[PDB]
Structures are given as structure tokens and as C-alpha cells.
Amino acid sequence: AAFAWEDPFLLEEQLTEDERMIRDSAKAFASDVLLPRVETDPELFHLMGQAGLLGVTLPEDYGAANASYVAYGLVAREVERIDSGYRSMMSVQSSLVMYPIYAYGSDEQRKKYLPGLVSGELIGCFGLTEPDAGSAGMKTRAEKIDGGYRLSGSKMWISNSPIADVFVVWAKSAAHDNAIRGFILEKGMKGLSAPKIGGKSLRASITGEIVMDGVEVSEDAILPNVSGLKGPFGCLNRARYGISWGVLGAAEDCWFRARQYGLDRKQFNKPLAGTQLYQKKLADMQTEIALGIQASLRVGRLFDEGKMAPEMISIVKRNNCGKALDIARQARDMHGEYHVMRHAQNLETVNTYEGTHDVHALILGRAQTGIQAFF
Template sequence: MTQPTRPRPVAPLDLLDVDSLLTEQERDVQRTVRRFCSDRVRPHVADWFAAGDLPVRDLAREMGGLGLLGMHLQGYGCAGTSAVEYGLACLELEAADSGVRSLVSVQGSLAMYALHAYGSEEHKQEWLPRMAAGEAIGCFGLTEPDHGSDPGGMRTRARRDGPDWVLDGTKAWITNGSVADVAVVWARTEDGVRGFVVPTDTPGFTATPVPRKLSLRASVTAELALDGVRLPAGAELPGARGLAGPLGCLTEARFGIVFGAVGAARDCVETALAYTAEREVFDRPLAGYQLTQRKLADMTVALGTSMLLALHLGRLKDAGRLRPEQVSVGKLNNVREALAVAREARTLLGANGITLDYPVMRHASNLESVLTYEGTSEVHTLVVGQALTGHSAFR
């Protein structure tokens, strides 16, 4: 009697035929970034993570050559892609490592977006072409040691001194901070919060790398200190008034995270599928056990629904209809689900799952930071709650 033919396994996102929802151009962008990550990031990222460093300038120049930096912005050397294309790029970058995606997000969706949306024409001409090419690195100085979720409480001050501005204060957890050429710094003035373009070679500006990180280790993180930093009047971002400026930048960055978290989850699911297919326990593949298949099924459902949510939000953004609370839904759900997937994948890999020979523990560690930055899960929960009830629970 012949044995029945075993069904051919399907890739996790093929289960919902997600590829059919993408245009050929979107698929081409995704393939290009995936190739770049396979060739340039994946062979080295475990060593970068172990060393607690990232070759930011080398990677930025290569990413600039591919058009990945500020890719969703128009003009000034930027690629001008769609929101979905940018999201798919973030997905592939974070499938390699969250720190690599953070480099691109901070450069393009925070520093470059701030200059593009709120800067003067002089700011744009001076910085954006070089930043798009990866020749200049930017960072975004908003978070402070005592004011993360409540940026309105910032203590960094900018005061007038004749025609100049003088900045004093400290910013914390700043990605790219110690390698940046320019910092977009937010400070309180007599007229409210304002943004400033600060070349990092300005006297009084220092950036100190954050040591002993256990997460986002393949990323450069720094503390910025501004001690009497004197800037000309033209350093102010003329289009930003109040907290709406930096919060608008954060919404841009959170959108990339919505897709990026899907990439981390996908890499964990694919790793778990490959490992359990090869790993034998009690003389049969681990993948053949019911408990294993339940875990794999739950992980894949979480991945698929997160991907569909990301695509929906991307289509809304391209149509000009995406609202900040919808981005909060995406970040809240997709990062939370990705972290759960990474933890479950680790259990399937057993002791092997805690080593850098496999990516799942690295993803789980990184996602602990992604869960917190660009708005904690608690903050995004309250944003959604306010949208539903009309009542603010922040104060």
C-alpha cells in the first residue's frame, strides 16, 4: 500500500496569499531590500550584536546608494516611494535586525522628515541631499532622561541672546547620536516648544554612547548634552510650532515600526519552521508533534494578521487618510504580537534558541526596546482608549 503524499509546506505569509495584495513595484522594492540584507547584514549582524556596535557610516552610504534613506520623501535626492514601499523596506530591514531598521527610521522618518516638513529651504538644500545619499548622518533629540512618554515636560531650554539662540539641556536614548553630523533638537522657548538644526561640531554639543545595553546592541545609542550651544537665528525650524512638530515626526517613525515588527516576527516564524523540520525528538521531526504545530499555527496567524493590518494602514497612508490613533493601533498590536512570536519561537529552539547562532533571542531582546520606544504600549493603549471614549486618561 502506497503512503499518501505529504502536502508541500507553505511559507507562513503564503498561507494568506499576502503577495497577491502587492503591486509588482512593491514586490521589487521588497526583493531589493531583502537581497541587501542577505548580502550585507545577515552575515555580520550576530557579531555586531555581540560587539554592541554597528558600522553606521558604511551601511548608510550603501543604503543611500539604494535610495533607502528618506525614501518616502519627495525631492532633494529622496526616492519619493509610496508609504507601502517604505513599509516593506522596513519589514525586510527589521527581519535582519531592529537596530538596522532603526538606523533607517531615525535618519529618514525623524531627522530627514523634520527637515523636510518643518525646515527652511536652506535647511533642506544643505542637509537632505547628503542625508539621502548616506554622506551625512542625522539624529533626533526629543527624549530626555526624565521625560520620555511626556515630552511636554522637557527641560531643555533655548533662549534668545541677541540674534542667536543658546541651547542648554540633555537628551537621552538618541539613536545615531554619537555618529551624527546633524541633530534635530527640540527645546522649550518663551513661545513654546521649537525645533533646532544643530550641527554636531557646534561648540558645547557632546554625544556620549550608552554602554552596557542588553537590547538593540547592533545600533548606536547616545546621550546628548547641550551646554551653551550657540546657534544662529536661522537654525530654528520655521514650520514647527509646539509639540505638534515632534509628534508628527514620531507618527512617521511609528508607521515604519508597524511594518518592521512584522519582519522580526516573520524571521522568527521562518526560523522555527526550519528548525523544527530538521530537529528530531523521539525519532521523529519536532514539527510532527501536535504541540509544536499548535505553536507554529498560532505564531503564523499572529504574523499574518499583523501583516494585513500593516498593509491596510499603508494603503490608508498612501490615500492621505491615516490618523495618528490608527498608527497607535498598528504599533500596539504588531510589536506586542511580534514579541510574543519571538518568545514562542525561542521555546521551539530549546537551548539553541538562546545563542546568536539563531536570530530569535536577538529579535526578542530587540523587540523589548521596540515595545517601549516611539511610545510605550501603555501610551498607545491610552491613545486608542481616548479615540474610543473621547476622554483623555493622560492627566
């Protein structure tokens, strides 16, 4: 019976036609547009959007693909296959910016921003973390004023803020009894600045601040349909879901390169991949990627059924980032060449962010036992 080593459990037959088509467009884009680059740009967002690869889960009313969370996962996978930096562009734009505008925003808000964000003509950022640390009891405040709000505070380490047109900012809103509310800020607004931050960590990325020096907005700039940490965390959860898929694509790329390198490199008149030690490693890569894909797929399906719980995402994010990083390192060690080293460097960064390996462990730990072990 037929066995596809590159697709052990036949993912291909678990996908809809739309999912396969949308992945194909993602793969063509990655090979034709992303790959030549790897062998930060606002035009690259516009290219991604025009390819229809931004906010794929959003309604056609905004020029989106109206696709499943599974399809979103497939897209991340095809893109991070090229580079995690490119996948990161999509995590921010789609899960951190368009999702909260769509899910928590008004129809006026949906109509103004989403079409521009989907196309990549508008660039967005997500302002939650503040200079203090990872400490949430945030200091950014939104004072109620005649006809709206006045925002004061600083967001720090914000992805794409120095090139953002759209700012989704979380702040304790006076007038909501200090509840955390989401606000949409635009680039030209008075007292709003997004300075870049120094230092070299991923490709195609830029980090900066959001400085709000008494930024005045009307009342329709607040996101009406959400309150509390539930809001930003919903975004983070969806980003992590996409990441759990993306790292599988980079993992695969390392696996395929490790395999091909071992077929191409000869020693004692046989390919390296003709030896047990080498084959054993290829077998472990194949296995872990196959397990990871089935888990993320399952989570995507639950997403679409509306039965996703954030703890599920902790499992696939922690497992897949861990396993993908291990695969990238093993692939690296099997050589001695560049692309495998690049994915590996990327995955070290990816494994760190959006909750560390150990933090997701303790989240799952608390969910099993009812006891928190964070402190």
C-alpha cells in the same frame, strides 16, 4: 487553488511594481550585507543610503526613492528580518531626522541636509527627551539673539547622537512665546557636544547626550513650518509606523526558523512539525503575522492618502509588537537556536519603547470614551 503558506493572503498581489522592486532591493541588501554581520558603524549608514534604503518616501530631488509609505514599511520589514538594530538605524535617520527636516524645514534646509542624509554620508539624531524622565514641559530653551538663537539645555538617551553630524533639537523658543520649535544643529558648532552614555541594548546602536552650552545659530536654523508637540510627535508616529512593519519581519524570521527547525529535528522517526502541538503553534504564528501585515498595509495606504490618524498607529504598533514578541518567545520555547533567541531579546526591547503596550491601550481607551485613564 494555489495557496502560499508563507504568504496566506497574497501580500505580493496587493503591492505595486515599485513596492515590490524596492522590497527586493531591501531583501538583497539584508541578505548580502546585513546578514553576514549578524552571523555600531557609520559606514553601515553609508551602505544603507547607497542601497537607496534611507528616506524612501522623500522626493527624487534629494536622491530619494520617492516611494510610498507602504514601501517604507516593506523596507523596515526586510531589514528587521535580519535584526531590529538595523531597522532602528533607519527609523531614526528617516522618520526622526529626514522627515522633520523635509516636512517642517525650508527649501534651504531641505537642500543642504537631505541629500547627505539620504546617502548615509550624514548621520542624524532626534533630540526630544531630556534627563528628567518622560516628564512635554521641556527645559531646553532657545533665547532670541542678534541674528538668531542661543540654545541651552541637555537632551538625554539620544539615539546616534555621539556619531551624529546633524541634530534636530526641540526646545521652548523664547520669542515664540515659549512655543516648542525645532532647530537644526551641526556637529562642529561651538558649545555643542554629544558624549556617549555607559552600559551595553540593541545591535548596531549607540546612545548619548546632546549638551547645548549656549549654542548660537542663525535664524535659518529654526524649522519654520511647525510649532508645538505636533512637530516631534509627527516624527514619532512615523517611526512607530515603520516599527509596526519591522517587527513583522523579525516575527516571520522566527516563524520560518521555528518551522524549519521542526522539519529538521526528528523524534520517534517523524519531524517535530509532524505533531499537533507543534503545528498548532505554527498556525498561530501564521495567523497573527497575516493579520498584522493587513493592518500595517492598510495604515500605509491611509498614510499615502493622507488620512492617517495617530490612533491607527497606536493599534498596529501595540498589536504587532505584542504579537511579534509572543511569536519570538514561542519560537524560542519550541527549540531545545541563536537567531531566534536574538530576535526575541530584541523584540523585548522594541515592545518597551516608543510607547509601551499599556500606554497605547489607554490612548485607544481615551479615544473611545473621551476619558483619560493615565492619571
